[PDB]
C-alpha cells in the first residue's frame, strides 16, 4: 500500500519486545519500506489460501498473542535481508531487491514452514511439537535461503541435489542466527521445537546423528521417503560445514577450523558461481574447493581444511 513509513513495537513468539518497520495509511501495515522493494507480512487467518491479507493494525502496537508470529516473521525477514546485503552484497533473494512476502497463521495446527516458490509461509504449530515457526531466526533464514538457492544454483529438490539444497538452508540459517546473535548455536529450530522439552532441536549440524541423521556418506539414505532423503542426507553436508568452521576430528580425520565468516564466503561463492540444478555431493566438494581456491589460493590452509572436511564425511 502507499503511505508513510514509521516504526511500531511489539512482542514476538518468545515474549521479547522489538521495533518493527511499518507503513501508515489509515491503518498501520506490516510493510517495511526501508529494505529493497519492501518486506510484506500477511495474515492467512488459519486458511491455506495465499497470501491472505496484508497485516493491518489500528495503533502500531503489536502485543496481542495473535500478533506474535507476524512480528517475528516480519522482523527476522528484515534481519535476513540485512545479512545478505551487508555480508554478501546481495540485494534480496533475486539479487535485484525483490519484495519479500510472508504469511503467518497458515492453516490450523500446521507444524512446518516453507518457501512456496513465491513467498514464505509459516504454520502456528500444534503447540506441543512446535510453537509458531517464525519465532526461530534460523527457521526464517532457512526458508528465505531456499529463495536464494532457487534464483542461483536452482538445486532440484530430489536426492543429492535436494540434500544440498536443504544443507545450504541450514548453513545460512545458522550463519544468520550468529549474525543476529541471539544465543547462536549449530542446532536447527531449537527455539520453536517442543516447548515441553529443553535442550533439543529438529536437526543438529555439530552432531547430526544425535537425531538419527547420517554424518558420513557411507550412512546415506537411499530410499524414496522425504524426496529421497533431502532432510536426512543433509546431515552429511551440515557436518562437513560444521567441521570447516569449527574444526575437529571425525572418524579419525582431523580438520583445522577456519571459522564462520570464511565458511559463509566459500559456500556463498560455491552456490552462486559453481553449483547447478543437478549437482551431487561430489560436485559440491569440487565447487567448494574451487571457491576456497578462488578466494584464498590453492596452497592455503582454507583449501586444505575444505578438503579435510569432505574427506572426513566420506565425500570424494
Task: Determine if residue 246 is left, alpha or beta; phi over 0 gives left, psi from -120 to 50 gives alpha, anything else beta.
Answer: alpha
Give whichever of 67 and 160 is closer to Ca ion, judged by the CB atom: 67
CB-nearer residue toward Ca ion: 78 or 125: 125
206 binds Ca ion (CB under 5 A): no
Annotated binding residue 61: yes
Cross-strand partners of 250:
253
Residues 148-187 that bind Ca ion (CB under 5 A): 177, 183, 185, 187
Q: Is the dihedral of CA 120, 16, 55, 196 positive or negative?
A: positive
67 is in an annotated binding site: no
Decide whether 28 or 115 has the Cβ nearer to Zn ion. 115
**Residue 41 labeled ligand binder:** no
C-alpha torsion sign, points 152, 156, 161, 164 = positive
Measured from the CB of residue 177, what is the shortest distance to Ca ion in angstroms? Answer: 5
Quick one: which of 240, 77, 76 has its CA closest to 170?
240
Q: Which stretch binds Zn ion (CB under 5 A): 80-88, 100-108, 163-171, 203-211?
A: 163-171
Q: Is 169 in the site for Zn ion (CB under 5 A)?
A: yes
Query: Out of 107, 129, 194, 301, which residue is the one contacting Ca ion (CB under 5 A)?
Result: 194
Give the residue numbers marked as catalytic. Answer: 143, 231
The residues that touch Ca ion, with contacts defined as CB under 5 A, are 57, 59, 61, 138, 177, 183, 185, 187, 193-194, 197, 200
Please state the residue numbers annotated as binding site for Ca(2+). 57, 59, 61, 138, 177, 183, 185, 187, 190, 193-194, 197, 200
The residues that touch Zn ion, with contacts defined as CB under 5 A, are 166, 169
Amino acid at each position: 500500500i502507499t503511505g508513510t513509513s514509521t516504526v511500531g513495537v511489539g512482542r514476538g513468539v518468545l515474549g521479547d519486545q522489538k521495533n518493527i518497520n511499518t507503513t501508515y495509511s489509515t491503518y498501520y501495515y506490516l510493510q517495511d519500506n526501508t529494505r529493497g522493494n519492501g518486506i510484506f507480512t500477511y495474515d492467512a487467518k488459519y486458511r491455506t489460501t495465499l497470501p491472505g491479507s496484508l497485516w493491518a493494525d489500528a495503533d502500531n502496537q503489536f502485543f496481542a498473542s495473535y500478533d506474535a508470529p507476524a512480528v517475528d516473521a516480519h522482523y527476522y525477514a528484515g534481519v535476513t535481508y540485512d545479512y545478505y546485503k551487508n555480508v554478501h552484497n546481495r540485494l534480496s533473494y533475486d539479487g535485484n531487491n525483490a519484495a519479500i512476502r510472508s504469511s503467518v497463521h497458515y492453516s490450523q495446527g500446521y507444524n512446518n514452514a516453507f518457501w512456496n516458490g513465491s513467498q514464505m509461509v509459516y504454520g502456528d504449530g500444534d503447540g506441543q511439537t512446535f510453537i509458531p515457526l517464525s519465532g526461530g531466526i534460523d527457521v526464517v533464514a532457512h526458508e528465505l535461503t531456499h529463495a536464494v538457492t532457487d534464483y542461483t544454483a536452482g538445486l532440484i529438490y530430489q536426492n543429492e541435489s535436494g540434500a544440498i539444497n536443504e544443507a545450504i538452508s541450514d548453513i545460512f540459517g545458522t550463519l544468520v542466527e550468529f549474525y543476529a546473535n541471539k544465543n547462536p548455536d549449530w542446532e536447527i529450530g531449537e527455539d520453536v521445537y517442543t516447548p515441553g522439552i529443553s535442550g533439543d532441536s529438529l536437526r543438529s549440524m555439530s552432531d547430526p546423528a544425535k537425531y538419527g541423521d547420517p554424518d558420513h556418506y557411507s550412512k546415506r539414505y537411499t530410499g524414496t521417503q522425504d524426496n529421497g532423503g533431502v532432510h536426512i542426507n543433509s546431515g552429511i553436508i551440515n557436518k562437513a560445514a560444521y567441521l570447516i568452521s569449527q574444526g575437529g576430528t571425525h572418524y579419525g580425520v582431523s580438520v583445522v577450523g577456519i571459522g564462520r565468516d570464511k565458511l559463509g564466503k566459500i559456500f556463498y561463492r560455491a552456490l552462486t558461481q559453481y553449483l547447478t540444478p543437478t549437482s551431487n555431493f561430489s560436485q559440491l566438494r569440487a565447487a567448494a574447493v574451487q571457491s576456497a581456491t578462488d578466494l584464498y589460493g590453492s596452497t592455503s590452509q582454507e583449501v586444505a581444511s575444505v578438503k579435510q572436511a569432505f574427506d572426513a564425511v566420506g565425500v570424494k
